[PDB]
Design a protein around this ligand. Sequence first.
Ligand SMILES: [Mg+2]
Ligand SMILES: [Mg+2]
Ligand SMILES: [Mg+2]
Ligand SMILES: [Mg+2]
Ligand SMILES: [Mg+2]
Ligand SMILES: [Mg+2]
Ligand SMILES: [Mg+2]
Ligand SMILES: [Mg+2]
Ligand SMILES: [Mg+2]
Ligand SMILES: [Mg+2]
Ligand SMILES: [Mg+2]
Ligand SMILES: [Mg+2]
Lengths: 255, 255
Amino acid sequence: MLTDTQVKELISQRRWADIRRALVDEPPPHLADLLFSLETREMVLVFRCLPREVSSEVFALLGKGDRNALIEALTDEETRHLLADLDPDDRTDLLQELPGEVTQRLLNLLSPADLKEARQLLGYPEDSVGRLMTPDYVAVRPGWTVAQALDHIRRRGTDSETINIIYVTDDRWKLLDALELGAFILADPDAAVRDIMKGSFVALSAFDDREEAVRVMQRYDLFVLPVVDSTGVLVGIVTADDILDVAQEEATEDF
Amino acid sequence: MLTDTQVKELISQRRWADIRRALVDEPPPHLADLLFSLETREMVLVFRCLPREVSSEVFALLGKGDRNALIEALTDEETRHLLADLDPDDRTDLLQELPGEVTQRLLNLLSPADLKEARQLLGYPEDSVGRLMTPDYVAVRPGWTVAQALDHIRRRGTDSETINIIYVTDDRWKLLDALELGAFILADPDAAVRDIMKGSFVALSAFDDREEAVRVMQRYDLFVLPVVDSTGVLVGIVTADDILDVAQEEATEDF
Ligand SMILES: [Mg+2]
Ligand SMILES: [Mg+2]
Ligand SMILES: [Mg+2]
Ligand SMILES: [Mg+2]
Ligand SMILES: [Mg+2]
Ligand SMILES: [Mg+2]
Ligand SMILES: [Mg+2]
Ligand SMILES: [Mg+2]
Ligand SMILES: [Mg+2]
Ligand SMILES: [Mg+2]
Ligand SMILES: [Mg+2]
Ligand SMILES: [Mg+2]
């Protein structure tokens, strides 16, 4: 419960260790509130005090002004480190909102694989599902056993957007099913994944409009939706937290 | 992919078995679409053909007119069976929208424990979180081991709204934490639940406005939120599918 007043005094006293200790374990939304209530110079300073695992989350929560100001201020390495750790859809959201030359130097701060990822995601139309989606889903093969699937989920879990739905893909990565995480812990560990499939699923197109993601998510009452290309290959997922934001970006735009 | 045309012919032929076979494994939203495109007499007839485990889901998806017409038409036992199987928040949604004497005979069709449940949930203010919430969450004790928690989740899973977040409560059922299901499958089965708690959580009040559920869910990017009473006792949960509906009931009401 550290206030704008207490941080600004600690800054004035150059009590940098006390600041970093005071920021430990604060929820990212609460850190985003503090950074907003600060003035630009101190907001930039407190942001750099954060561990990079925290500051990437907080960055995604900031307003456009604070976000843009913060981009105008961090160094090349600090920026490079934010772009690496941002979730791919959050990385896209920044690049579509920034001016061209700024997005372009940002792009040059990405690693080759991250450049290819970011290039692909910005390449879907604006207001498309492809541009809302993240490729950090967890997928399993139909021929794996449930125990093997569970070891894959455990290895890959925290590095991924969500594990609450697990996707099944074939060898050519085409989407076969969408399974709740619970199905794997209710099932017999020696059963194949194919034993717990129903073979029916809802999926979006990457070229769907963002509002279709809202309509489809309301229709089927799911918290995550897979996105497939024209051949049925799984290319990413969209999650309910981002879809709720779309619902009220689109709602106010109607007003 | 059974159409309004094919069902109406089967009805005219009195091919009731063929109808029940044609409805097997159709997603509830697709059944709700078919029932809407029908006329009232056939919609009521096809609804009764459904297994009660299906028809309860479909009922929650229907429009107010079709829903109300269907209440005017099912028998006392058929109504009794719908009210039992409806999720408690979906049961509330029907009772707050129906006229008084109709809600009152409905109430008399409930079992004692279901009457006490429904009475309590309608007793929160209209437009409150209490009236959005369902008590069908899954909770564990902090002193249980992860293996014991996992057996409780398995016993209680499909009878509950979601298992994607598991709540920790003490002996007096006060909320101690909110844990992702993944935490239990990553953890050592012999660890206590208290070993995987962080002891911090977001919770709503039952007397919060429905729009606060929207604001809090957007703020913390969660798919489920617990609801606590003034003493901190867990009383229910709200889920993102219902909150997305609130967001656009409230959005259009602004327009
Ligand atoms: Mg994110
Ligand atoms: Mg548009
Ligand atoms: Mg990555
Ligand atoms: Mg819905
Ligand atoms: Mg996201
Ligand atoms: Mg519009
Ligand atoms: Mg429901
Ligand atoms: Mg209101
Ligand atoms: Mg019940
Ligand atoms: Mg949010
Ligand atoms: Mg519900
Ligand atoms: Mg309003």
